[PDB]
Amino acid sequence: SVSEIRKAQRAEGPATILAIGTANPANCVEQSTYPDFYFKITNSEHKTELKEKFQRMCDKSMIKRRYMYLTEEILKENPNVCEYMAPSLDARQDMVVVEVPRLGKEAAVKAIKEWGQPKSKITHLIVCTTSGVDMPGADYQLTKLLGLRPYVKRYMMYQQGCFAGGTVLRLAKDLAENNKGARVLVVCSEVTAVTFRGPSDTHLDSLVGQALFGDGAAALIVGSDPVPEIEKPIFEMVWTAQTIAPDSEGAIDGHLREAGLTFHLLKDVPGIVSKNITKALVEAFEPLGISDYNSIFWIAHPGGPAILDQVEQKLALKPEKMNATREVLSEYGNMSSACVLFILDEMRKKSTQNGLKTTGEGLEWGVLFGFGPGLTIETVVLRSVAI
Template sequence: MLTKTRQAMKIAIMDRKRAGLVVAKLQHSLLCSYSMIHKDIRQMSTKNVEEIRKAQRAEGPATILGIGTATPSNCILQADYPDHYFRVTKSEHMIELKEKFMRMCEKSMIKKRYFYLNEAILRENPNMCAHIAPSLDARRDMIMEEVPRLGQEAARKAIQEWGQPISKITHIVFCTLAGMELPGFDYHLIKQLGLDPSVKRVMLYQQGCFAGGTVLRIAKDLAENNRGARVLVVCSEATVALFRGPSQTHLDSLVIQAAFGDGAAAVIVGADPDDTSLERPLFQLVSASQTILPCSDEGSIGHGQVSEVGITFNMSKNVPLITSNNIEKRLEEAFTPLGIKDWNSIFWIAHPGGPAILDHIEAKLGLKEERLRATRQVLSEYGIMISSTVLFIMDEMRKKSMEEGKATAGEGLEWGVLFGFGPGFTVETVVLHSLPINQTATPHDKSTNRLN
């Protein structure tokens, strides 16, 4: 009996071990299955994310698909400006300062400029004619009227040249030095043009003369990271915030009065142009970067501030030298990947900043005179229009290239650079690839009104 009991217990123990092994194997099998399922889910999830990311991005680089510009109707010849300026500011008694200002205007290489401000407006706002007097509210009201008006005019021209329905616009980038409002000028432009309320907006204030490159850099990122995106870029600048009477102790303000003018420029930026809808790209935006130059700070190179008297600037005589001493490094960083070392083999769209800056750049790099022809032409015909200036130069270059029968919109050359210089001292560098003219649009050649 005892033997049978022991045998039964032994059998029970063996059965329990077998059962434990079975359970362990089953658990292992379940764990393996769970691990494989989890791995498959993870792989599927990763694959889905990658597919989504790929589907969201454009295949090709961002391109310029249309350009438009606008200026106020009030045009003043540079030769007449000293008399006009000292008359409207009631400063004709400052004879020596006026003579100094006349020499500044003569050396500026500017023939004429366009302004919103005229004598009638300034008579009604005498505080704006003083060098330092409370006038911010009056300036703000004018800016709120003129900046969006000019921007809208330039935008309509760019859209007309682009030739596509405005329903295809997906993003807006609006830039201006002056004015601040909530919601901003980007919001108002959507309303004025009748764009879809879902259009995504970027509003840039208080940037300065380098920002013509900034807006292209932002638009490039938007276009290349959002498949099918069409970005309306608008730079609209008015000197309303900068205008003030002369001062014996603040000669840097006279530099602004002698050189700056009003103007707006707009471009349409998009990747993967649609051949079926006759989109004709002018330039590809190959790369874009921003840098603060070494050994420069806001106090020594350029510093602006907003106060109850408007925007005041402190400027430095060292800007031309600092710019020319640092520009070749920016070029090397941008063009080494392309194997380009000859700076005369590329076309140039450089923010003018004044003749001294251009002369220093030419001398430092050994540039031929024709390389900065478009830049000097725009400086001559419009003065310095802050962020919009480089887009005016781009427009001038492609028009002249077409008129002269060049092979590309970039003066017949394949590669080019756009430089923006401004406070900080900040430099924007955009590498451009110019496309054959027979693939590009003739300026404003599309008669169909697309603003509906």
């Protein structure tokens, strides 16, 4: 009796991305003048050697601009947030408990418009953030804001970190594939108001975060068995993995304290990622008979430019493989979990714009990586869609 229920309950094909929408806070922060702005707003103009260090960090970040909820006015009303270490979580929480779901909503509405189907067909909702926590969570808030059905099945992924654009895909794949008819709204929404803080010359790792992290949200619609010519596949998920790199204990740690979310880097992240990326690739692609890593399309969490450069150098990727990734890093900076989803959007839009044969730059198979605390590597194997 259960066998019949099970066979009738499950979906049949591969989880597919059917729509992608993004959004960012309206405030555009140029990187070229950021060092001058940041050192003034944090009352750190006298830390001249540190300021020079920050300028080099920003000049080498390969980020031209970021979008930030935080403004000069907001920072002027919250001096505790402008300090390196002052009690400020309640202020930060008040910002991000509202801004996460607000920005998420903006991205989600865009994806839902693109998908074109009734929002009442959304059966599952995954919400992911590294920016603040609350109960009921941002999943409840987004259900209310969007007018989803009350019986949507929710998955609130809090305090996840930069690899979770990969984690939400891994999770959505099982939801979509094991449930016939299921349509999963996937929302990653990240707001750096929880992490912004002043500079300290004995905490340079912390300072790196201030050059790289930016805000944004991305939303997907994921489902199996798309309805031919009503729904429009963009990418298909085939296989996923998550692993912890050896010798990386404590590489990237973030603690949520009374002073907000702190960021620490205790190990060479570019070097750990580059030494371990090959093994992740062979686990994913050896069973598909593929070993030429220029023959697949690429999406890599741009944690900083050095991760990308060292990965490219390790594997001998052509410089063009990382173009969509670098274009997102350039235009938005490191938006933690949302970044990889912006990169998927950029890639399928550019491929479609330029008349390529597939959404994956004209290539069939592709890989998406997320990198973050653990040190964790998330791998998602994708297949593109014709046109």
